[PDB]
Amino acid sequence: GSPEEIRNLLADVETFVADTLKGENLSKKAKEKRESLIKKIKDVKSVYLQEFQFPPIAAQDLPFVIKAGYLEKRRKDHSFLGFEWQKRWCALSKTVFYYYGSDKDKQQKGEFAIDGYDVRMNNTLRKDGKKDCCFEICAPDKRIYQFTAASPKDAEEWVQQLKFILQDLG
Amino acid sequence: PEEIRNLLADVETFVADTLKGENLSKKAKEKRESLIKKIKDVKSVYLQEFQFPPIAAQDLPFVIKAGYLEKRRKDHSFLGFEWQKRWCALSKTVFYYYGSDKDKQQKGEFAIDGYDVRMNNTLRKDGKKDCCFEICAPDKRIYQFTAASPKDAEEWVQQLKFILQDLG
Numbered sequence: 250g251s252p253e254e255i256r257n258l259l260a261d262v263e264t265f266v267a268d269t270l271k272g273e274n275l276s277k278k279a280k281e282k283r284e285s286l287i288k289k290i291k292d293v294k295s296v297y298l299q300e301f302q303f304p305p306i307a308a309q310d311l312p313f314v315i316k317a318g319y320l321e322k323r324r325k326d327h328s329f330l331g332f333e334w335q336k337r338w339c340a341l342s343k344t345v346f347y348y349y350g351s352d353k354d355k356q357q358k359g360e361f362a363i364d365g366y367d368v369r370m371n372n373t374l375r376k377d378g379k380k381d382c383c384f385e386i387c388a389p390d391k392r393i394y395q396f397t398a399a400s401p402k403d404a405e406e407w408v409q410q411l412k413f414i415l416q417d418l419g
Numbered sequence: 420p421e422e423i424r425n426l427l428a429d430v431e432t433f434v435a436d437t438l439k440g441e442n443l444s445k446k447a448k449e450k451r452e453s454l455i456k457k458i459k460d461v462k463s464v465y466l467q468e469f470q471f472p473p474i475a476a477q478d479l480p481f482v483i484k485a486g487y488l489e490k491r492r493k494d495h496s497f498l499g500f501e502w503q504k505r506w507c508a509l510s511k512t513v514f515y516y517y518g519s520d521k522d523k524q525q526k527g528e529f530a531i532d533g534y535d536v537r538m539n540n541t542l543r544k545d546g547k548k549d550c551c552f553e554i555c556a557p558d559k560r561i562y563q564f565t566a567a568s569p570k571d572a573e574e575w576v577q578q579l580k581f582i583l584q585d586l587g
Binding site for chain 1: 420422423424426427429430433434437438441442443444446447450451454457458461464465467
């Protein structure tokens with residue numbers, strides 16, 4: 250509605266209905282209703298997506314997918330050794346960046362939490378005509394992920410979205 | 420926006436009605452009660468979007484607009500009854516009027532559904548004449564008001580017209 254405070258409420262609502270009432274000695278009608286409300290609480294979470302725009306998990310079950318798309322991906326330290334870019338379906342699910350073989354896979358090839366990372370355009374990562382499509386996601390532990398996006402715009406949109414999440418959430 | 424208030428309606432119904440007289444522990448009861456007051460409290464945040472038992476002026480829920488006005492009924496003006504200072508408050512779709520902002524109880528009130536409203540600069544021989552309006556009930560009763568400036572009048576009309584129309 251006018252958001253923070255409402256999400257503050259719904260958080261308390263969820264704590265209540267899901268935990269506080271757990272174990273309680275409730276009518277059959279009240280139990281059935283509690284299960285309902287929990288599901289509805291769950292589904293409503295997706296609504297606050299536009300505002301923002303590790304266990305195995307399928308591509309299609311990722312919750313709160315802020316951005317997803319095909320990118321080429323390559324770690325910096327593989328690049329030095331001459332390893333080819335890999336086509337990956339990348340997803341930013343909440344604060345965690347996931348990568349898969351395609352959007353239908355049942356399990357991720359890898360992921361990482363972006364807290365603390367930096368991101369930027371970087372036109373030097375490739376020698377061909379696709380070099381304008383490139384950005385990198387820097388780890389604190391010095392790990393660096395390089396991407397090529399499908400167009401200069403595709404890349405910029407990724408860097409903007411990721412930069413938004415990295416710094417407007419403190 | 421809607422989707423959130425729809426959830427909150429189901430929420431308020433569960434916590435306040437479904438859970439009424441259920442066999443709840445002390446902590447579940449306390450938390451229940453504490454959530455009820457929290458659900459009522461948030462209601463005021465959707466006020467901007469819109470801008471009979473005795474009830475005090477100050478316990479009135481969802482006050483879209485409120486103010487001092489002079490009130491008179493047209494059918495009473497004929498007999499000579501004059502304008503009286505009233506604190507008026509639109510609480511949802513109900514128009515309340517009190518002798519002051521502090522009273523314990525309304526002099527009266529009416530729900531405005533199906534009413535009309537209009538500016539009417541023909542009701543006073545005064546320097547106050549460009550600042551009156553009327554609210555007209557379907558039963559043909561007409562409530563005339565004088566506001567504290569022409570702008571204040573138009574504000575009440577705009578505000579009333581808004582509720583009387585896009586609520587629907």
